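Researcher: Here's my situation. A collaborator sent me these components and asked whether they could plausibly form a single complex. I don't have experimental data yet, so a predicted model of the whole assembly would be a useful starting point for our discussion.
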Amino acid sequence: GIVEQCCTSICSLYQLENYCN
Amino acid sequence: GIVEQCCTSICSLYQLENYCN
Amino acid sequence: FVNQHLCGSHLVEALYLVCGERGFFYTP
Amino acid sequence: FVNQHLCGSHLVEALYLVCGERGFFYTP
């Protein structure tokens, strides 16, 4: 999930936008 | 929604918790 | 911190603190 | 601000800034 992708590893705009409504 | 209840008016713990997963 | 007007980043912060490991949805 | 390790309040802040009026879900 987001913690694994953005906290434990380097985040990306691509991945952040997948959590926008 | 949350903006009307917590921003435009005074928020509450009761209402905030309704937005927790 | 919760019983006041909370807008924008201030509201998201309150949700974060209140909800903890549950997380939350912010639907403005 | 997005291409780095973002944890806790820092991650919620990034979601808030990126998603704008759409809002977002934070599911840790």
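Model: Some features of this prediction you could bring to your collaborator: Strands of chain D lie at 24-26. DSSP finds one helix and one strand in chain D.
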